[PDB]
Amino acid sequence: KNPKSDKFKVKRFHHIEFWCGDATNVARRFSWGLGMRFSAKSDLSTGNMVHASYLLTSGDLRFLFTAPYSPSLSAGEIKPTTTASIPSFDHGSCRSFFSSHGLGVRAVAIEVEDAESAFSISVANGAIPSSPPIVLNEAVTIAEVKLYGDVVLRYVSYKAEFLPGFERVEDASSFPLDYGIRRLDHAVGNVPELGPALTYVAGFTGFHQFAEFESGLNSAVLASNDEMVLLPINEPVHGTKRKSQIQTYLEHNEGAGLQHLALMSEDIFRTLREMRKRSSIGGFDFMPSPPPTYYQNLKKRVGDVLSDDQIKECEELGILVDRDDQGTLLQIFTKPLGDRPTIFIEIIQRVGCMMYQSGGCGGFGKGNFSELFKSIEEYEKTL
Amino acid sequence: KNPKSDKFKVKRFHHIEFWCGDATNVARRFSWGLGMRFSAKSDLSTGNMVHASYLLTSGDLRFLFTAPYSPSLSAGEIKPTTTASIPSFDHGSCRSFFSSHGLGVRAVAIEVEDAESAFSISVANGAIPSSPPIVLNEAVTIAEVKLYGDVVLRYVSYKAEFLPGFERVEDASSFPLDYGIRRLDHAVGNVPELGPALTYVAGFTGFHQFAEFESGLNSAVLASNDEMVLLPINEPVHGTKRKSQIQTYLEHNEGAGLQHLALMSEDIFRTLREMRKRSSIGGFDFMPSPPPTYYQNLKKRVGDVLSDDQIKECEELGILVDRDDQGTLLQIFTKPLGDRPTIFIEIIQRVGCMMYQSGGCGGFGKGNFSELFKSIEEYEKTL
Ligand SMILES: CN(C)c1ccc2c(c1)Oc1cc(NCCCCCCNC(=O)c3ccc(C(=O)C4=C(O)CCCC4=O)c([N+](=O)[O-])c3)c3ccccc3c1N2
Ligand SMILES: CN(C)c1ccc2c(c1)Oc1cc(NCCCCCCNC(=O)c3ccc(C(=O)C4=C(O)CCCC4=O)c([N+](=O)[O-])c3)c3ccccc3c1N2
Ligand SMILES: [Co+2]
Ligand SMILES: [Co+2]
Q1: Which of the listed residues A126, A153, B162, B365 has the most CB atoms within 10 Å of its CB?
Q2: How many of the other CB atoms lie within 10 Å of CB of A213?
Q3: Is B31 exposed, middle or buried (0-12, 13-18, 19+ CB in 10 A)?
Q4: Burial class (CB within 10 angstroms; exposed 0-12, middle 13-18, buried 19+) of B314
Q5: CA nearest B65: which of B100, B101, B89, B49?
Q6: Hey, how many other C-beta atoms are within 10 angstroms of the C-beta on B318?
Q7: From the candidates A24, A28, A65, which should be mutated to test the interface with B, based on the most B CB atoms within 10 A?
């Protein structure tokens, strides 16, 4: 059931913005670890005396890394005279965010038809405003409302190149790395209470609950009309045998925030080969792999979708596989991206639901809680 | 003239500590860019609820990257019950340092015979105390005094593995990168006034002025008894044709601080080949190279030290060459390590002064201000 109840026209995920202490070092690490190219900048060299912002791209995926300069560089400016390229930026907010949460996502940005209308309708329907609509060079409109914690939902609309005031990066600085990542599939938040978080966000967006076909969490997914903007939300389940990883997140993050970004790959085998080669030389580490019993059990579950050789490749790379009634999901998770056990990344590829591929084909891997738990108990028995 | 006036026994540079917002991302970037191996850690996985600290090593060079966790994790601790492995660490000081200065060096650490004696003698001779001597696991003593700005001189002494409470890193996480860097040669501070800075530091150390054989700075070098701990200090010269880069540093850093670290390489050609290959894939960028006229002029200046092929290799890599009356220096400078135009790195190799090599052989490259200026004017004439 998809009631198509979006209260304004939503296109696709546009970018994700990380708030950093040093944008340069985070952006360079992420570029090498994920195979993303340096594509635009806004910093002292472009006249921005307020913040340093570096944009990485891979296909349609856009990661923005922003850090504040000394406020003394811009102390004489006011908002009408600002040199910041992102008018919602505030030195105090950014330093407070980073001190509270450490490295993490500040903005989940979606492209809409009209960001001023999206903002007005959202606030009329309960959204807490964060930054009012601002028109940049008569060409782009940006507005922000609160999503959860200190994460904002950012609306961007284009009259017709990332943002005005950003410059394309020199060819020499822009090495054409590419490990196969192509777009953001979903972005997941952790909150203390799922019910009120869903009511709030669905209330101001009109996003509907996406259908899904004891492990420490309850979750639900909100989706746009064509189900290409997907926003899962998790809450902890307390009193469990093992402590909820959602609760550990909330403790180390100092509250609600973005838990993981799932990045679609056009070739998950190539992406993981390339990422795993770089894990110990500046890139990202991956969670420990399932036992061999998990891959032996894959034949019964997805033997009509993957060949034995393709299953063997999943085992080589530690890929997890899940299936719903409509399609199949290949997924794997990194270790946390920074110092705190908070945000991490998921790499995914979806098989099926061809009509274009429909959004969320194969689900989100909820079946892998039980399948991994069974295979580890079975591997103890094998031993 | 070397009066050997050290007021306590000093051995060698021991480590450099960076204060970061996210230690993981800075350490991974530096590891890949400089070819340093992950060698020790102190973090949540080792029981440290206060700070994350990651140690990189290349030869005898040790870089420590430290960032604070949420204070809530350790809110019930007091100094007698702390889980921090570096007892001088303070959440507030670290956040204040990073907000003020951005990514940069907090501590220049030297190994001494007795850190408690070094501390006591230094303070008796005018040093401003920063952290009193603390004995760690009855095995290592650490103490800190102010050096300049918010940079401290850290004394470490060992009864007889980096520090107690640090753990060696897993072989899988510890890829054996090595681009040829072997030790810290010198560490340079920028201050508003050179005279009072030299009087203060030489006053409490007994370090002597190291002999040197219009461009925006005045500088002097302080040296230990065997001239293996070398601490140059720069001040701006105002009213110049081009604005002093020392003054630009002071503005963007919010005052005095560490300007550059010079890292000795056992094979500067290999080091720069390896570093330049990685500049656009997560590593470090280098300053623009001298014009060909500079390398043509090298024959007259160092043609008795370097062959034509060795000079051609310097030209390929953009290496600068300088000479004093005792030896020859090969050097090159990176672009700033982070967002702000503040700290950068120098790679150096010294030729001559064999007796071991004596410290500071060939000087610090002061002759390269005029030689680069002449060669750029000459290259305009060639054109
Ligand atoms: C000493 N000795 C030798 C030893 C002794 C005893 C044990 C032992 C060793 O061994 C173990 C190992 C464990 N460890 C197994 C780890 C299982 C956790 C698997 C998580 N699995 C996912 O598959 C998943 C899927 C989707 C999403 C995802 O993306 C997503 C969304 O997008 C939206 C909707 C919500 C959502 O979750 C996400 N995710 O992270 O978000 C994750 C144990 C665990 C529990 C109890 C005992 C254990 C034991 N006994
Ligand atoms: C438009 N159009 C086409 C154009 C027009 C006009 C010009 C033009 C183009 O072109 C240029 C280029 C310039 N740019 C040349 C840059 C020269 C700077 C070289 C710095 N050179 C070092 O060699 C060094 C050595 C040692 C240490 C070091 O390590 C150290 C220590 O360890 C301890 C002691 C102190 C110390 O310094 C360090 N260092 O950074 O610390 C550094 C100009 C500059 C000035 C005026 C006009 C310029 C021009 N006209
Ligand atoms: Co997911
Ligand atoms: Co130098």
Answers
A1: A153
A2: 11
A3: buried
A4: buried
A5: B89
A6: 17
A7: A28
Distance (Å, whole) CA B158 – CA B136: 10
Torsion of CA A367, A373, A374, A378, to 10 degrees: 150
B84 to each of B52, B73, B87, B132, B142, how far by Cα in Å?
9, 11, 6, 16, 13
- Residues forming a β-bridge with B145: B129, B153
Compute the radius of gyration of chain B from its Cα atoms.
Answer: 21
Q: Which helix (H) or strand (E) holds A64?
A: strand A61-68
Q: Is the CB of B234 under 6 A from ligand 2?
A: yes
- Axis-axis angle for helices A194-205, A115-124 (nearest 10): 130
Tell me if residue A242 falls in helix, strand or coil: coil
Contacts of B174 in chain A (CB under 8 A): 280
Let me know if A170 is exposed, middle or buried by CB neighbors in 10 A (0-12, 13-18, 19+).
exposed
Domain regions of chain B by residue span? 1-178, 179-383
Q: Which residues contact A276 (CB under 8 A, 6 or more apart)?
A: A286, A317
Separation CA A283–CA A84 (nearest Å): 30
Distances (CA, A) of A68 to A44, A65, B276: 11, 11, 28
Q: Give, using CA atoms, the residue closest to atom 19 of ligand 1.
A: A369
Q: Among the residues of chain A, which ranges form H helices?
A: 23-34, 91-101, 115-124, 194-205, 245-253, 268-277, 292-296, 298-302, 308-317, 368-382
The stretches of B71-129 forming alpha helices (DSSP H) are 91-101, 115-124
Chain A 54-73, CB below 8 Å of chain B: which residues?
A: 67, 69-70, 72-73
**Spatial CA neighbour of A30 closest among B278, B281, B54, B63:** B281
| Close Cβ partners of B344 (under 8 Å, ≥ 6 residues apart) | B259, B260, B333, B334, B335, B336, B337
The experimental technique behind this entry is X-ray
- In angstroms, the separation between the Cα of residue A35 and the nearest Cα of chain B is 9
Angstrom distance (rounded) from CA B260 to CA B63:
14
Rounded-to-integer distance, Cα B60 and Cα B365, Å: 23
- Resolution of the entry in angstroms: 1.8
Q: Are B259 and B186 in contact (CB under 8 A)?
A: no
For A92, the 3-state DSSP assignment is helix
Beta-bridge mates of residue A286: A334
Backbone angles phi, psi at B274, to 5 degrees: -70, -40
Task: Kindly state whether A29 is in contact with chain B, defined as any CB-CB distance less than 8 angstroms.
Answer: yes
Residues 6 or more apart in contact with residue A161 via CB below 8 angstroms = none
Q: How far is the CA of A49 from the centre of ligand 4 (A)?
A: 29
Q: Ligand nearest B217 Cα, by number?
A: 2
- Cβ-based neighbour number of residue A98 at 10 Å: 23
- Ligand closest to B368 (CA) is 2
Compute chain A's Rg from CA coordinates. 21
Taking residue A281's Cβ as centre, other Cβ atoms within 10 Å add up to 16
Contact between chains at B252 and A100 (C-beta distance less than 8 A): no
Structure tokens at B262: 């010079």
DSSP 3-state of A91: helix
Which pair of structure tokens corresponds to residue A335? 């270790």
What's the Cα-to-Cα distance from A196 to each of A129, A200, A367, rounded to whole Å?
17, 6, 25
Tokens 């070398």 sit on residue: B230
Within chain A, what is the greatest distance between any pair of CA atoms? 70
> How does DSSP classify residue A119?
H
Residues of A in contact with B26 (CB under 8 A): 22, 25
Give the strands of the sheet with A208-209, arranged side by side.
A208-209, A217-223, A230-236, A181-190, A257-265, A344-352, A327-333, A320-323
Strands A140-148 and A151-158 turn out to be antiparallel
